[PDB]
Amino acid sequence: SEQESVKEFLAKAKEDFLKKWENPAQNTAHLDQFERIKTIGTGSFGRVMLVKHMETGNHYAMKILDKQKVVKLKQIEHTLNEKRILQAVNFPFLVKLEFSFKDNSNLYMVMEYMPGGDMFSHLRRIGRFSEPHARFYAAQIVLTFEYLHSLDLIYRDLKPENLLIDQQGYIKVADFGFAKRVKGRTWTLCGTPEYLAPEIILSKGYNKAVDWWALGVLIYEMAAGYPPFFADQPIQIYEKIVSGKVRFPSHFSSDLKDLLRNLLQVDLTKRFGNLKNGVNDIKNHKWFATTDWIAIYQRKVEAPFIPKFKGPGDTSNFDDYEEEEIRVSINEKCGKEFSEF
Amino acid sequence: TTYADFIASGRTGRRNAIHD
Ligand SMILES: O=S(=O)(c1cccc2cnccc12)N1CCCNCC1
Question: Is A1 a domain residue?
Answer without folding.
Answer: no
